[PDB]
Paper text:
Many sequence differences between different SARS-[name]-2 variants and variant sublineages have been mapped to the spike protein (S protein), a homotrimeric glycosylated membrane fusion protein. S protein initiates cell entry by associating with the major host cell receptor, the human angiotensin-converting enzyme 2 (ACE2), via its receptor-binding domain (RBD, residues 319–541 in SARS-[name]-2). We report the application of ancestral sequence reconstruction on coronavirus spike protein, resulting in stable and highly soluble ancestral scaffold antigens (AnSAs). Cryogenic electron microscopy (cryo-EM) structures with high local resolution indicate how an intricate network of hydrogen bonds between the RBD and N-terminal domain (NTD) maintains the AnSAs in a closed pre-fusion conformation.
Nodes 3 and 5 were selected because they are closely related to the extant S protein sequence of SARS-[name]-2. The ancestral sequences representing these nodes were referred to as AnSA-3, AnSA-5, AnSA-6 and AnSA-9 and share 83, 79, 80 and 55 % sequence identity with extant SARS-[name]-2 S protein (Wuhan wt), respectively. One dataset of each protein was collected in one session and readily yielded 3D reconstructions at an overall resolution of 2.59 and 2.77 Å for AnSA-5 and AnSA-6, respectively. For instance, S284 (A292 in SARS-[name]-2 S protein) creates a novel hydrogen bond between its sidechain (NTD) to the backbone of F310 that is located immediately adjacent to the RBD domain (bottom left). Additionally, the sidechain of Q602 (SD2) forms a hydrogen bond to the backbone of C512 (RBD), thus forming a stabilized tri-loop interface between the NTD-, RBD and SD2 domain of one monomer (bottom left). Besides altering inter-domain interfaces, several surface mutations in AnSA-5 are involved in hydrogen bonding across monomers. For example, the RBD in monomer A and the NTD in monomer B are held together by a hydrogen bond bridging S386 and E490 in the RBD (N394 and E516 in SARS-[name]-2 S protein) and a salt bridge connecting E490 (RBD) and K226 in the NTD domain (D228 in SARS-[name]-2 S protein) (top right). Similarly, the protomer interface between RBD (monomer A), NTD (monomer B) and S2 helix/loop (monomer B) is stabilized by hydrogen bonds between sidechains of S815 (S2) and E273 (NTD) (A854 and E281 in SARS-[name]-2 S protein) as well as N274 (NTD) and Q534 (RBD) (N282 and L560 in SARS-[name]-2 S protein) (bottom right).
Residue numbers in the entry:
A (entry chain A): 664 to 1010
B (entry chain C): 267 to 650, 659 to 713
C (entry chain C): 912 to 1110
D (entry chain A): 317 to 415
Write the structure that this text describes.
């Protein structure tokens, strides 16, 4: 046990007549990871609560619109996940095809553009990102026959499907997302910022970087006078991204934990069906087998209200988490416009 | 059915919710008119029409005569326990011969006894005066409950008693005092104390005594309903199996509904049913063949109905989520469906989307802007006659930039643009009088 | 009609939430009746209170649901109101360099207009149009030393080299006023030879 | 378990309350206060069997280890048919017009 270090100890050699001027520079490439969407969860509220039984379903009608109101909430979450994706990507709906030459002024975009030798039209970097996040529960999409196996084939995802819990697929497939990012990097490589304001105007890439140096307040000559250095520093920095993404799993933790949180929530929701909630049994057919309506209904009501309470908890948690994902998607959409479609003075 | 009631309270419209996918949509949305969209739809397609009842073929009738009509019962201090096993509990044979002034059951309804099966039964028997049968219940107190025969709080079973003042004349004993109460189903046969005088009081039973003092026989049946072989069953006859259909079933008194199939499951030698982490009973041992059947939900898998507005058309399309188009007629139990739904099982206008099989929308190779979002790149629209068409959505216009290392495009003109951005700032300031709403 | 859909759906969502809350009073929640006086008329307190408790708990649960949805929706409206307040400061009370913040194109102005439960911004933007291809060079070499554009870019109309501002073609004579000189012209890749006029 | 109870020791007057020479007519039911005594009701097990023993707000099995801040005993004679009317929420000639 120890006290935290707040930071490195440092001092500034202040004097009323002294200044430090940088004599050199480093081109730095930095990775920012942002969540944009979450799993479009869906619930058959009758199948979850009453588990395919008429007696319970006829009791559940006496609770009114609770189920309809929960489904209305979750479909609101689901539609919002597609909105989030189409607000971050799809800001530019000119599908600028990837240029045939991936080197501009010495800057080697080949790792961040698609490669036509591969079967999947991702960039090389995007292939690393799609490998480095894992859908640790095998990621839903359980095929029609797959839940009818031996004992060892039992699976919380089959327990989910049998109890009415499902994940809808996103509207944009990954090939469509990769097509937008390919178009966005292609416009930046060949038309700079202009295609964010209007029609894309081609400009030579070094000449575009020279304007970007002026935006920083480094004189235009300092680019051309060092263009091979600057391009090499850029190329090496991109390679360091590729090396870190191939080696290191923690980089995308902000996305893996969105997967983990939503997987865990669905797992607790199915497991809550094993609770009695003070009924004689957690099992609905066991009550209906063993008790007659005059007193079964008292036991069923304990299950209905407890199960129904467990759904309302889950939907509230999803509404909370969805608001956080929306805020991240709104921020990511702002960074697309301001960092990709332009140059930002915002420190 | 969903029924629309007029202000005069006459029915003016109705939807048969099982009829077709539009009817299921209307019933799912609790509404007779539906806006354009795609909606998750609750299963009204299928309901069980059959019972699959299967019970062990044990045929020996339970020993009601030997247990109830024994020549004499025990003194309550010396109550006797017997195991009842491998028999059919057709208790209706008694209706001809006795009437019980108490028949009271715990954890089981008495009307259910005729179609349950029990993994264990023990009958306890003793004689007490009629006023004391009151005390033979969980949580009771009194000379019987304290010092002669205690039921547990977790008791499941039935207490049965009848007057026998004509039969059970004589002397019978009960413990009036003890230094500590009995534990549940404890017995204490000690007659003499340390010095030799008896610790037991005597019932004097005669038909001449007042009713409250007259002898009643009591039988206490204690039950178990474990995940173990059935030992006593009600008289139910067994039916044939009906696999691959949504049915009601009853295996050893475990009722339910679902789809039965063969299964790969290894059960334990004693095990009668299996449950997943949700306690959903996913398998059962057939008591007739000892084969293990899988139980699937009748409603299993997601279904969604795609519609223009019902103001626009009564045409719909159905998405069978994660189902392959050749499996739809079996994932949906299309043999059990109406003809109007079975149209949406098969035929032309089936299209395998990565979201699932889409049926009833014709696939079109022209891409358009997304109208109704089906998923995984597919959208649908009500499109020119009109029909529901399904297509891959267009991401944007095809374009290319004429890049060269020495070419630049400069704007020669400009447009002043005025753009409208609409932003919500407020919502209605709702308020609730919580007492007026609730009470 | 669709232009204000973002306002109409705030109205619609809040109307629908109140309508479902009144309709929820029609539920029994497993009581013998949804109607409170019907229970109290028909049952004695010893056992009416068991039925009344089922109504109280289910009704109170329905309020807790409604209030939770309102807290969620109010957090969303607050984020929209904070963003609208930021656009008032940055797009109305100034001019914003933030690329897509005050509408598409380069922001000139915007005007706020009141709307029910909302604001409408009329964003005014310059959109460049009718672009034309030009040959261009990073620098001019005049007398062994490299001249760079002071602002804009060097372009030629085929015959002649000019300096123009980048967002509107207005060619100027390349003058020691329009340009700064920095270093010998060997280093600049793509350097070209042209006169620089000296007034 | 730390069990601590007041050290009152006088046994409650079960014989005088229950085995009185006669009970009141139900219209003239009599109330008596019971106080400063130990309610070891098991002394009755030897001598009297009760065809009704029904408790409200307390389980009868818990009577042996509770203490009460007041006790009153109401006593009256009725026909056995009518004892069902001696309960909360009952009706009938007793519940309406006698007790
Ligand atoms: C900034 O520092 C780098 C070294 O980190 C300098 O790069 C070296 O430059 C000399 C002469 O140009 C070469 O001989 C070395 O091989 C270079 N090394 C590397 C790693 O590039 C660079 O010149 C410095 N920049 C400026 C403007 O002086
Ligand atoms: C751009 O970067 C790549 C390195 O990623 C350069 O080298 C090629 O890299 C791929 C793997 O990424 C190999 O399969 C090729 O064989 C490599 N080619 C060579 C010649 O080494 C690529 O050359 C770079 N482009 C430019 C124009 O420098
Ligand atoms: C920009 O384009 C507009 C047309 O879109 C030009 O305006 C036209 O100019 C001619 C001659 O002056 C008129 O006859 C037309 O009526 C004008 N059109 C409109 C809509 O007013 C304008 O001259 C161009 N600007 C520049 C700087 O070239
Ligand atoms: C559905 O089709 C895919 C091939 O497109 C196949 O991999 C999968 O196993 C099929 N599902 C079933 C249940 O046969
Ligand atoms: C209700 O009944 C009255 C009288 O029969 C009739 O005039 C009125 O039109 C009815 N209302 C509706 C909505 O049909
Ligand atoms: C019912 O009792 C009659 C005589 O009282 C007897 O003949 C008959 O066999 C009895 N039936 C059963 C089922 O015990
Ligand atoms: C009990 O058994 C005796 C002897 O067989 C018989 O006479 C009597 O009728 C039986 N009682 C009942 C209720 O069956
Ligand atoms: C009775 O049970 C046995 C064992 O479970 C089985 O072999 C037999 O087929 C069943 N039915 C008949 C009619 O024998
Ligand atoms: C759409 O294009 C595919 C090409 O793979 C073709 O097979 C199919 O017949 C086309 N559909 C129509 C309706 O023309
Ligand atoms: C610029 O040149 C390319 C090829 O010469 C051409 O495709 C493009 O349309 C030109 N742009 C303009 C604005 O004329
Ligand atoms: C280029 O512009 C100059 C204007 O000073 C003009 O004299 C020359 O002819 C132009 N050339 C072409 C090809 O337009
Ligand atoms: C531009 O490209 C041409 C070949 O297309 C080449 O000859 C020339 O040296 C290049 N110049 C620059 C500045 O990239
Ligand atoms: C520019 O001028 C210098 C000196 O006159 C000459 O050496 C060089 O080759 C020229 N460049 C071109 C491209 O003509
Ligand atoms: C009531 O008191 C009388 C007189 O002492 C006694 O004979 C009788 O047995 C008592 N009753 C009971 C039930 O103890
Ligand atoms: C119990 O009854 C006996 C007589 O049967 C009597 O002698 C004894 O005192 C009684 N005990 C109590 C505690 O009343």
């Amino acid at each position: 046990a120890y006290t935290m270090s707040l930071g490195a100890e440092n001092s500034i050699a202040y004097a009323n007549n002294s200044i430090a001027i940088p004599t050199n520079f480093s081109i730095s490439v930095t990775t920012e990871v942002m969540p944009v969407s979450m799993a479009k969860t869906s619930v058959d509220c009758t199948m979850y609560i009453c588990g395919d039984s008429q007696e319970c379903s006829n009791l559940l009608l006496q609770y009114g619109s609770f189920c309809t109101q929960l489904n209305r909430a979750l479909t609101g979450i689901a539609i919002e996940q597609d909105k989030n994706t189409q607000e971050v990507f799809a800001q530019v709906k000119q599908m600028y095809k990837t240029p045939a030459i991936k080197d501009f002024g010495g800057f080697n975009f080949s790792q961040i553009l698609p490669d036509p030798s591969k079967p999947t039209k991702r960039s090389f970097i995007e292939d690393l990102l799609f490998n480095k996040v894992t859908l640790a529960d095998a990621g839903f999409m359980k095929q029609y026959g797959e839940c009818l196996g031996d004992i060892s084939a039992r699976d919380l995802i089959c327990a989910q499907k049998f109890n009415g819990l499902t994940v809808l697929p996103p509207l944009l497939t990954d090939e469509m997302i990769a097509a937008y990012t390919a178009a966005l990097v292609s416009g930046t490589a060949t038309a700079g910022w202009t295609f964010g304001a209007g029609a894309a105007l081609q400009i030579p890439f070094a000449m575009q970087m020279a304007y970007r140096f002026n935006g920083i307040g480094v004189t235009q000559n300092v680019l051309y006078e060092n263009q091979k250095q600057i391009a090499n520093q850029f190329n090496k920095a991109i390679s360091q991204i590729q090396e870190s993404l191939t080696t290191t799993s923690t980089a995308l933790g902000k996305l893996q934990d969105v997967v983990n949180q939503n997987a865990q929530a669905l797992n607790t929701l199915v497991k809550q069906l094993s609770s009695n909630f003070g009924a004689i049994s957690s099992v609905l057919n066991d009550i209906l087998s063993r008790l007659d309506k005059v007193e079964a209904e008292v036991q069923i009501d304990r299950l209905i209200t407890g199960r129904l309470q467990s759904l309302q908890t889950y939907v509230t948690q999803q509404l909370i988490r969805a608001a956080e994902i929306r805020a991240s998607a709104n921020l990511a959409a702002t960074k697309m416009s301001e960092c990709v479609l332009g140059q930002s003075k915002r420190v | 059915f969903m029924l629309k009631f007029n202000e005069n309270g006459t029915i003016t419209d109705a939807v048969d919710c099982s009829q077709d996918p539009l009817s299921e949509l209307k019933c799912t949305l609790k509404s007779f008119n539906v806006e354009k969209g795609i909606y998750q739809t609750s299963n009204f397609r299928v309901s069980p029409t059959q019972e699959v009842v299967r019970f062990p073929n044990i045929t020996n009738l339970c020993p009601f005569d030997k247990v109830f009509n024994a020549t004499r019962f025990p003194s309550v201090y010396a109550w006797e326990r017997t195991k009842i096993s491998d028999c059919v509990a057709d208790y209706t044979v008694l209706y001809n011969s006795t009437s019980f002034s108490t028949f009271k059951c715990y954890g089981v309804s008495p009307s259910k006894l005729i179609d349950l099966c029990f993994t264990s039964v023990y009958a306890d028997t003793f004689l007490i005066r009629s006023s004391e049968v009151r005390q033979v219940a969980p949580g009771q107190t009194g000379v019987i409950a304290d010092y002669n025969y205690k039921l547990p709080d977790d008791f499941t079973g039935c207490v049965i008693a009848w007057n026998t003042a004509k039969q059970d004349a004589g002397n019978y004993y009960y413990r009036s005092h003890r230094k500590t109460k009995l534990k549940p189903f404890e017995r204490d046969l000690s007659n003499s104390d340390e010095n030799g005088v008896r610790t037991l009081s005597t019932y004097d039973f005669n038909p001449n005594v007042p009713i409250e003092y007259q002898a009643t026989r009591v039988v206490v049946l204690s039950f178990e309903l474990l995940n173990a072989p059935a030992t006593v069953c009600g008289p139910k006859l067994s039916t044939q199996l009906v696999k691959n259909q949504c049915v009601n079933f009853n295996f050893n008194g475990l009722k339910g509904t679902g789809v039965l199939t063969d299964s790969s499951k290894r059960f334990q030698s004693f095990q009668q049913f299996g449950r997943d982490a949700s306690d959903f009973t996913d398998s059962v041992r057939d008591p007739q063949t000892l084969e293990i059947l899988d139980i699937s939900p009748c409603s299993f898998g997601g279904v969604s109905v795609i519609t223009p507005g019902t103001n626009a058309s009564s045409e719909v399309a159905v998405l069978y989520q994660d189902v392959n188009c050749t499996d739809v007629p079996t994932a949906i139990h299309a043999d059990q469906l109406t003809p109007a739904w079975r149209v949406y099982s098969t035929g032309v206008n089936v299209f395998q989307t990565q979201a699932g099989c889409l049926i009833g929308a014709e696939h079109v190779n022209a891409s358009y802007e997304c109208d109704i979002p089906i998923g995984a790149g597919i959208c649908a629209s009500y499109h020119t006659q009109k029909s529901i068409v399904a297509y891959t959505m267009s991401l944007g216009a095809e374009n290319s930039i004429a890049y060269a290392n020495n070419s630049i495009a400069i704007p020669t003109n400009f447009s002043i643009s005025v753009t409208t951005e609409v932003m919500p700032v407020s919502m209605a300031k709702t308020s609730v009088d919580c007492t007026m709403y609730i009470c | 009609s669709t232009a204000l859909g973002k306002l109409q759906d705030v109205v619609n969502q809040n109307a629908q939430a109140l309508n479902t809350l009144v309709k929820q009073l029609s539920s029994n929640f497993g009581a013998i009746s949804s109607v409170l006086n019907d229970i109290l008329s028909r049952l004695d307190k010893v056992e009416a209170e068991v039925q009344i408790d089922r109504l109280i708990t289910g009704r109170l649960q329905s309020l807790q649901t409604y209030v939770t949805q309102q807290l969620i929706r109010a957090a969303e409206i607050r984020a929209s109101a904070n963003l609208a307040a930021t656009k008032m400061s940055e797009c109305v009370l100034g001019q914003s360099k933030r690329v897509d913040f005050c509408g598409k194109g380069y922001h000139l102005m915007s005007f706020p207009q009141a709307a029910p439960h909302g604001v409408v911004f009329l964003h005014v933007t310059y959109v460049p149009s009718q672009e034309r291809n030009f040959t261009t060079a990073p620098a001019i070499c005049h007398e062994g030393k490299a001249y760079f554009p002071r602002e804009g870019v060097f372009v030629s109309n085929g015959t002649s080299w000019f300096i123009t501002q980048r967002n509107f073609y207005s060619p100027q004579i390349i003058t020691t006023d329009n340009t700064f000189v920095a270093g010998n012209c060997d280093v600049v890749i793509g350097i070209i030879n042209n006169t620089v006029y000296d007034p």
